[model samples]
Target chain A: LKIIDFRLRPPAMGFLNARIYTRPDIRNRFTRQLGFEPAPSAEEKSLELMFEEMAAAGIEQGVCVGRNSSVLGSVSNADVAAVAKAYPDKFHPVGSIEAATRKEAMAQMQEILDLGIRIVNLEPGVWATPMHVDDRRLYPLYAFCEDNGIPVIMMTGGNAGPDITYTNPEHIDRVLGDFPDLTVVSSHGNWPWVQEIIHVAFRRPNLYLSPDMYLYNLPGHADFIQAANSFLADRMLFGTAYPMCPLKEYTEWFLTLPIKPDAMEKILHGNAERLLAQAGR
Target chain B: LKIIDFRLRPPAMGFLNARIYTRPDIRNRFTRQLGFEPAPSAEEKSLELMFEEMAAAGIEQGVCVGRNSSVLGSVSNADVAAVAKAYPDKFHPVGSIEAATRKEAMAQMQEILDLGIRIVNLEPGVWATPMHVDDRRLYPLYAFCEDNGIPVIMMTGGNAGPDITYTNPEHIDRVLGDFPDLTVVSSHGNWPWVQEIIHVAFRRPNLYLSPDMYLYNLPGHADFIQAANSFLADRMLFGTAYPMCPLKEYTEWFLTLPIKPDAMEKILHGNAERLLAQAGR
Candidate 1:
């Protein structure tokens, strides 16, 4: 079976930009929650190492989400492209954008698109103050992606950030309403609002559900399990959220979910394969 | 194996309390989320039906949460006590209190305690106007529960009410700090802010983690599973938010979590059994 991970920040990229996950506040939070020392994995600090790990875990392809300087400094289009170039069949780079204003972000979006990056990721969760997606700063990015056929993938719910307002899917509803043509994917299952994401995914044909960081413990798994079998089956995608939890660990456990075998196939690789193909074509 | 469900509101009571879950706004929300018909189980609309289902699921004891009149009218201490009185071995009454003023709520708490209810539940999530636990209005309830030695059970996360501000566990920190002697159970999984709940659980010995509404899809289940096995084992309580999901379904799925056998024993019944003793004594 060919598996695809729609979201993953490899250890190699995290090594260069430890700013995202290495914050003392977040570390302390994890330590308290997990009751053990929680530290970023410094091993597997190269692209080849990541691919080898992915290969061992049976993850045939994945989207390496790019983080702008604001989130993880210096993991840009070229940085993401290099890895995908090295292992074209195994990885696809999803570029990111950040700016103080709409015009600036749009300019950066054009540059990112010029680099052949078809998906634009935003990390309002990591932003200094963390504004909601409906924040005017993100409006232009949505419009740009709609015009360019570049799908927008973002952390829609369940953020690790201190300020969690950005994670509300309600904010994205306005964006989707305004840009009906915009292809969007909610990373991390959009949890807590599990049913909300499923509803939005049904309401907007262009929107998709990608269970990246939230594969195992999705809030409305029972509902989503049935929904996938009945109506919203075609729109869901699989993701590993590498480093936080490896592909092998998530997949071995994920296969046990009561989803239809056919729907499971689409979630595993078919949906992501189709999504990326739309961008390439 | 003894099983104690620390939270459950059956559909029998739901008949008189359909307003709480069947509100037009909430119904619309569910319909949108499900993209199909969202419903209250009409099959389990009688107390006997609930008991028969509970018996089949092997739930030995459970906390029958009393919803306020405004949320679920007529589900007072007598209503809850009637069930417990009939089946002392299988159910325990946890009363509810709500009022327009602190004095009024305090009076209700005292009366409920006098009437021999060992626990008082508050519905900030369903309040006519929602407020956080740290709100001045709730301070007196904390003080009352502390002085009277009654455990307080409230919705800590994942609210169905219009205003969600009351669901944040951080707001409960001040209450925990001020009334360190008061035993409190965050009656839901305290989701989305899984680490926040864990952090507070670590900081406050009097606070317990009860996965009432969140057993199957806990936000940080892996970490929570790990913590329950380690130092925080005794602090966790098992709950089946009945009628929302059946006891058998949650039990079968909960048993699948990678938790230690000892921890499971405590969560299943030991913690709740001990907690009630503190009140009754």
Candidate 2:
């Protein structure tokens, strides 16, 4: 199966020891596995690393995502811009304008667009919770992305986020309820609550799929899709987060699975291409 | 302010090479510190290493949290039973039974209780979603702990955990809502989301406090208490996540906090003793 890694942490390899990835001998065991080790530019490099691995694994595309996020106290936009420019077609950018910087978010949006990238994703973690589409804080980012026809990817968990005032896919429904033209790619595949994302997409055609966290990290990868049925297979997009979870490891089990070849086709490329096209890519 | 680290990861050290915690030679650089290595882990040795640091720091209670969580395919009833026997009061057994042999879990729980350990913890990420709490799968484990009046901690995020679920305290309400008799500890102080945890505990009587992930990871320990309000101050439990987040850090901050002296007493010894008493610990 051809896969598209939404994250490529080349930035990780650019700075890490060879033992981190290339040294397969003790890869599984390490002392500092406490995860307190700061991966400052790792997010930016994560995409690069994913792409390199994806190429080796024979995947079709790798979207090195960008985050207009805060690293310590700095913004990830500059590094994101670098990744997008370095890997234009092979990479993608997800811009964030957490609550503190909402004032200049549109300007950041313009900057992300200026970086010659199209897809714009945001995690509600950084912003003020907006229950409805009326949240002006979100409107600017959405409006700008919509004006430019970009797709937004948002994470599902609540703590360290704006608020769950409007956190579910139903919340996305509230956002697209008014602005049907805007497209959103919700993660966790809005799972378990799979009904919400599906219901919203059924309610509005503008929604797409981007299941982060669980699918990439867990063993239920293919079954998660199979269990998702029309909701995921028909509408969900393919996104593998590599380096953190390599595409190669997933493909081993992925190829052995029972699935309609066509559905996999759509998820792997067709859906993403269409989403990118809508974003005016 | 004492942190009882149940997570036994060693990645707490450095790829940054000792520049982080106010090195004798220079200040730790927080920003732009890129991680070239994989995140740290809680290996067996990490337990020893962190414990050493804690001893050096002069910790009174080690809270030698043991076992590889059975829910995450780690640990066993035997694993925890041995811990209780080994440390007695110095180490509190926070056992995992969600995936253990039921008979083994019961025997282990009984053995640990007889040994005087009352805390039971689970990474509840064993299941993909929160709905599992309602499922009967976890009931046997809960039944065992509840029968004994032991507290169970639902770790939302940590090793191999989903971030959104971990950070959100909703699951605390969900799990406690089901097993009303079960005492639940929101470890990590739910750091980063200490506020949300406080809110959950305020509304639900079952939620208890144990600082696991945050205090050592980040400073400014005292402000969290004031932010949480004195009401929660009463529910707070003193936990030095042992080695990971040392007691020395908490002792320094707790003794020197800018808040009322009473708040410190409640946070450190008073609240923990009361909760333990309530659990019949």
Candidate 3:
């Protein structure tokens, strides 16, 4: 099945370049290290590495979200643009916008659009630190996505700043309910808050689910099981944000799920394709 | 610091053995095929591999939790007895019990107590699984421990038999509050419910923390840095429910914790030693 891998490559170096932190010194160093440029997998082996992982996991399509590096290398507009250019149909590039340069964010959006990219993913929540979804500055970014008809995928991870509860379940309700037209797919089963995301999906229709990172690492998840029993037996979408989570393993994990064949199809490829197609991928 | 993991295995083979039903079984055969047991390590050396990893991670003493075979195996009582005999000091075997067979449960408790084992751990909410925690059947088990002063650790994995929130955080509170003098631990970070357990600890001084499994396996958490960042950093107890989550990787994640040295000391050996000694173990 096809999968949209929600991941951000540091326009600079490695995965840490994409890490969100609240500590000023650490965050600054991280930003400086990952310069405000784009690390498009196309220019190098990054996309190849990503696709390799995806292909291994039996996934043919991937959607990688990157920030266009600027303002501490915060976005990956160029990176997504590159992936779109190279893979085209295989990759539905989700570009990023730098908060510092709204113009750059807009330009990156256009660049991705020009590349036939469907979604303009923003992670201002992560850059500011500890995935605080409620952060005010990010609302503008959300507004932009809503206005543009591009869906936003919020990261369920450490923000590039102070780790807090801003990526909270309550905020999800407010955000999803507020923007009915805009869909927010929380990447990685929202990892640490695995159960909280379930709460959101149970409550809101627009709140989508993806067990990307969680399945990649967690082998026996009591939370995932309880989550499934609670309501996500059908809600959770099966996709791994690759590289961070191995591919073959994800494929193996997804295959073992105890849901309807149709639901499995949705997670593997159908659900995302429909979501992407509906959201204008 | 030395640690004795408590909730390494499920209570019964059915609980441990049953494939929580991930049907349409396409790729996740690993979850079903392997059961709830941990996946092999990079080298596939089994549980000991983690010790080597842990030793390098600056951990010297390791404590092992017991179960028949992944908690689903019915031969659990014999499992702990053997593990303790094999490893002795390196692996402080914590005995297991089912709330259903209170007589056999108490008998096994007596055996382990006579075995001079330091800890008696059970699944969270097991007390009520057979009906009531204070029921005559389970009373003997708790009474024996009370008389002998053995600290019991309960697995707070949420829900006992599947329907409602039977093993909810409040269920733990009910038991711990019922037995104020009983030294009990709320395990697995009681994750997604850390706040519940944390509050449980705050209200009832008997509560302790153990971010059980999902060590490096937690996506992006690599070293449990995310879990460290997620909960009350200080109260975290160190015990990698080995074979499920190895001591080595647990320490790998443990060492990566950016918490202050003082906090680390408390988590690593200091807390366990203090708690064990306080419980007269």
Q: Which candidate is the best by DockQ?
A: 1
Q: In terms of DockQ, which candidate is stronger, 1 or 2?
A: 1
In the range A36-91, model 3's lDDT, one tens digit per residue, is: 12122323435456566566667677666665333234434565556556656676
**Residue-level lDDT tens digits of model 3 in B1-281:** 44434333322222233222112132134333423333343225334555455455565555545432232333454565666566555545566665457676867677666666667767524333434333455556666666667777766553332434544454565566567777776556455455334434534556666766533344323224423333334445776554444344455655666766666666777767666566544
Chain B alone, TM-score, model 3: 0.70
Task: Looking at model 2, give its docking quality level.
Answer: incorrect
What shift in Å separates residue A6 of candidate 2 from its native position after superposition?
Answer: 2.7
lDDT of 1 by residue, A217-236 (tens): 43355656777787777888
Q: Give each model's clash number.
A: 0, 46, 41
Cα error of candidate 3 at position A117, Å: 2.7
lDDT of 1 by residue, B158-250 (tens): 763454556665566667868889888877756656655654665577888876545454456655776687657898888866655566766
Give each model's whole-structure lDDT: 0.69, 0.51, 0.53
